[PDB]
RNA sequence: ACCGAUAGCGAACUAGUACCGUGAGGGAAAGCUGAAAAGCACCCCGGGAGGGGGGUGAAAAGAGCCUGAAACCGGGCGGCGAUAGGAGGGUGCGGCCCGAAAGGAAUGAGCCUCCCCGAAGGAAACCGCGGCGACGCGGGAGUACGAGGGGAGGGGACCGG
RNA sequence: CGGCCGCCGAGACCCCGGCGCACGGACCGAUUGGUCCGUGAUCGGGUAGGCGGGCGUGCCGGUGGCGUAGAAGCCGGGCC
RNA sequence: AAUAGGCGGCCGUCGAGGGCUCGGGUAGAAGACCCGGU
């Protein structure tokens, strides 16, 4: 298996190698969800959010969307979201994935990985948000 | 003898061709590298035990992936799974 | 019928009985055959009796539209279909008597093979609205059965 | 819009279904300072009324008023178990708990029937109506040892929260034989004081006198009597249809647009209706009795039973609690307590108000 | 050189019959045991209808009788089977199962090893140079490889379906 | 936005083997037929429609046969 | 709740724990649910 420490990483460039390695054939852990960072404004980020919390099915709710609001739900989602959910060989893929946040008291001395491509030194400026912040503003419990 | 992963089938965006396919060597990550193997055996080895036999005729992009050709075609529960180099 | 859907049938070990035209329901019929398949003749016997009796229900598998359940677990809807559990009865009876003859011990058989199927129909007509002659049928059963003396 | 009216009944107790259980679950707990249980059981007994002087903000402040009264009867509570919970990653766990071994039963109303003599009854044996498999071979020593690895954990930090475990006693007052398993939460800010709290009452019984206090709020947890199945109209309060509708008239009319092409979860539906789980808040403790008797002035003392027994219950003979206006459930129903997790900013004061009247006549 | 029981006259037969309409008038369906009834004597069970033994017959062809298909239903067997989405199929293969005959095959199958030629096409290591860079140019080299076409050895029962 | 460098990607284009068609040629079979050779980058989708060959069914005139050592018919399977 | 949970107890590698049957409703269209059963 490969834990992925999630500190400073941009979340579409880290969900786009973890699904690619999901799909590969590796177990993927990663460690730190609530700390990847979002670029953008911060308005905006979180409006997208709230209508994505938002969305439903009229004639049943429990049907309808449900689109996450804890930070480690976002980070899985966001990687099913790169994933051929509707077949079965997506289905084993996301099937290999676990993503906590913090460092859980069973990982603790183990190396954690980064993803190069996906630091956000390459970014010009640090105008970004947090998962975390996103989540705290949705109402997540963390 | 090496080590592989199966990527996938040789395909465009919406046709896939059955008899070759992606192998990925465990370490090469070059073309320069992957030219080594041309004309090298790939073996897949089936649940029940059945062999399955392919060859390396051509590298497959710049990552050091290689292309190999099977009399008999993976059946696509081998996509994922783990080939062996000669 | 005369014939019987058994291949292997041994006269040594076996015996067999069966009845035809039966005026019953042949989806109970199929229902309760299902749950006879199996037993031993007494446990079959009694479990014949119960049903008549109303003690016991019998589940139902395949036909058992707008049925409610009963209590106890596995129901799930069940009835008691006395017409059915006496026909079968006297078939089993039947065949007790033919291993019985034959000279196996009774209290070793066991219900190796037991089958319902559709039989001729016999065709009638009610009167209804706007004057249409409608059908009205019965639908009759026949039933086999072997059994096999265990050891 | 043309013509506006509010939506027929409540979206907010959806689905309306059967309760889970008879016996009422707590959710949620008021947070207080004060090292005791938080809450009590009883069952319900009936319906009086009384008259007393209003002592609540308002107009009639000092005036003799007309107040109905829910009697429910509180035989005391056995504390028998401890649970300690330590913090998962999604929410609380149970670390660990542990239960005092068996006594003997020393309330039993056992009567020496001719032949055999009095049953001897003890505790495991009430209780094993309940939980049905108990411990075997459970001594003092290794339920002290339990303990002291309980108090260990949580000197060493891991145990989060502490609450007890408690049991009814319906055979005291005569009620049924089955007791009823509940745990409650404690008051205070320290776990080693909750802990110490419940072990020194570990094995003992509590009665309401030594946890609730008297002319507080509180809120009553309960299961509303059931009414099996019901139409919408008495379900959710629609209007009936016009009186030439040869299509019935307790029915909803249309069920729905032609688009979306499905039926909305929001229509008007028979169902089940009653049996549900139901919170009221604000309710005031009017009197905590004792043995059945109600004292009013030191020096007269009455019997809270009406005249011919309540009806459709028994005698009370145990302490009751008088609580002011209605409660959810049926005669005999469980009914639990809380400390009010929701009062008012003005709040009536703390104390026995002055009753000038107590309704004891029949009631049948 | 007509049809062969939904055909041929409506009628191969108790057919212009049964039956429909007050009437004028309208008008069906329905052939086959066996060479010979030799058409099941006797026994057990069942209220009976029938069932099981035992007989007859070249063959039950058993009167519900020549042959006995399809649709439908019951049982046995092989495969799948309660976290999975597309008109129920197409291409490729992998599990499990059947494989006596008519297909190949002990005059040798799947399979393993070795040698030769080879169309279109076609690398890399290594070395020298150009470009800010992704990279490219010359030698390696039209080499390794390549559809397919041939030869030799080992093993001994499967390949096709 | 102005340019550049690699790679992936069709039944298209190239090569190998096979089929048919169009045209011309040489042979044999006593009626429309058969074999082989040569050319095709300048032949190979197809609705209405036109033309050629072939498969299958009942009866008749001939010819050669099969069948109670098992015909027609019917269920499953092998080969062309 | 497909990451398909935690804890104390009881049993198995004869057997805990149940269902039907019995007397009644804090329940009820069938099921289900609750109290009692020397």
Same mark, same amino acid.
């Given at each position: ?26 177990? =993927? ?69 676990? =993503? ?19 630091? =956000? ?22 | ?20 396919? *992606? ?32 060859? *390396? ?27 062996? *180099?000669? | ?28 019929? !199929? ?19 119960? !049903? ?38 006297? !078939? ?52 086999? !059965? ?6 | ?31 207080? @300072? ?87 009854? @003890?505790?495991?044996?009430?209780? #094993? ?21 309980? &108090?260990?954990?949580?000197? #060493? ?22 007791? &009823?398993?509940? +745990?409650?939460?404690?008051?205070? @800010?320290?776990? #080693? &004081? ?15 006198? +030594?946890?609730?206090? &008297? ?13 099996? @199945? ?59 009795? #004792? ?74």
């Amino acid at each position: 298996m490969r834990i992925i420490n999630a500190e400073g990483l941009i979340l579409g460039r880290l969900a786009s190698k973890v699904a690619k390695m999901l799909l590969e054939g590796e177990e =993927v852990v990663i460690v730190n969800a609530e700390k990847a960072v979002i670029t953008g404004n911060r308005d905006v980020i979180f409006k997208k959010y709230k209508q994505r919390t938002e969305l439903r099915t009229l004639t049943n709710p429990r049907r309808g969307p449900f689109y996450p609001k804890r930070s480690d739900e976002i980070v899985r989602r966001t990687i099913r979201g790169m994933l051929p959910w509707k077949t079965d060989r997506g289905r084993k893929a996301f099937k290999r994935l676990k =993503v906590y946040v913090g460092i859980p008291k069973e990982f603790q001395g183990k190396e954690l990985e980064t993803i190069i491509e996906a630091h =956000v030194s390459r970014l010009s400026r640090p105008k970004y948000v947090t998962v975390g912040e996103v989540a705290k503003f949705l109402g997540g419990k963390f | 003898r090496i080590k592989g992963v199966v990527l996938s089938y040789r395909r465009s965006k919406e046709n896939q061709h059955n008899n070759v396919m *992606i192998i990925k060597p465990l370490d090469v990550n070059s073309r320069e590298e992957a030219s080594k193997l041309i004309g090298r055996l790939v073996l897949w080895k089936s649940p029940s035990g059945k062999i399955l036999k392919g060859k *390396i005729v051509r590298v497959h992009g710049t990552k050091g992936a290689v292309r190999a050709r099977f009399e008999k075609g993976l059946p696509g529960q081998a996509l994922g799974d783990y080939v062996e *180099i000669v | 019928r005369f014939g019987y859907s058994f291949q292997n049938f041994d006269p040594k070990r076996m015996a067999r009985a069966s009845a035809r035209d039966l005026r019953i329901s042949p989806k109970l019929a !199929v229902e309760v055959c299902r749950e006879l398949r199996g037993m031993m003749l007494n446990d079959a016997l009694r479990y014949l009796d119960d !049903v008549i009796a109303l003690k016991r229900p019998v589940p139902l598998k395949r036909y058992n539209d707008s049925q409610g359940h009963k209590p106890g677990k596995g129901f799930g809807p069940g009835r008691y279909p006395v017409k059915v559990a006496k026909a079968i009865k006297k !078939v089993l009876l039947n065949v007790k008597n033919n291993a019985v003859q034959k000279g196996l011990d009774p209290d070793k058989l066991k219900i190796i093979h037991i089958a319902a199927h559709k039989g001729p129909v016999l065709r009638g007509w009610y009167p209804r609205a706007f004057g249409r002659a409608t059908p009205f049928n019965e639908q009759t059963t026949h039933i086999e !059965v072997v059994v096999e003396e265990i050891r | 819009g043309k013509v506006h009216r509010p939506r027929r009944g409540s979206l907010g107790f959806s689905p309306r279904k059967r309760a889970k259980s008879i016996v009422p679950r707590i959710r949620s707990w008021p947070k207080e @300072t004060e090292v005791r249980m938080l809450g009590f059981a009883g069952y319900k007994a009936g319906m009086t009324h009384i008259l007393m002087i209003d002592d609540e903000p308002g107009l009639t402040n000092g005036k003799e008023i007309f107040m109905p009264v829910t009697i429910i009867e509180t035989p005391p509570l056995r504390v028998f178990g401890i649970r300690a919970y330590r913090m998962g990653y999604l929410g609380l766990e149970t670390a660990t708990e542990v239960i005092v071994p068996d006594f003997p039963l020393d309330n039993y109303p056992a009567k020496e029937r001719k032949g055999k003599p009095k049953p001897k009854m @003890t505790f495991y044996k009430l209780l #094993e109506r309940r939980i049905a498999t108990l411990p075997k071979n459970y001594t003092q020593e290794m339920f002290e040892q339990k303990l002291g690895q309980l &108090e260990d954990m949580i000197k #060493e930090g891991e145990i989060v929260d502490v609450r007890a475990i408690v049991a009814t006693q319906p055979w005291v007052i005569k009620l049924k034989k089955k007791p &009823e398993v509940m +745990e409650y939460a404690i008051g205070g @800010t320290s776990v #080693e &004081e909750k802990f110490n709290y419940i072990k020194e009452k570990l094995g003992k019984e509590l009665r309401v006198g +030594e946890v609730l206090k &008297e002319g507080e709020l509180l809120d009553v947890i309960a299961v509303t009597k059931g009414k099996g @199945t019901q139409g919408p109209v008495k379900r959710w309060g629609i209007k009936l249809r016009a009186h030439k509708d040869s299509k019935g008239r307790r029915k909803v009319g249309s069920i729905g647009p032609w688009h979306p092409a499905r039926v909305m979860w929001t229509v008007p539906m028979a169902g089940q209706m009653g049996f549900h789980h139901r919170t009221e808040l604000n309710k005031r403790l009017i009197a905590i009795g #004792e043995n059945g008797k109600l004292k009013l002035d030191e020096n007269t003392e009455i019997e809270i039973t009406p005249k011919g027994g309540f009806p459709h219950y028994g005698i009370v003979r145990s302490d009751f609690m008088m609580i002011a206006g209605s409660v959810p459930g049926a005669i005999k129903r469980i009914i639990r307590v809380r400390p009010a997790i929701r009062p008012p900013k003005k709040k009536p004061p703390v104390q026995r108000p002055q009753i000038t009247y107590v309704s004891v006549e029949s009631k049948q």
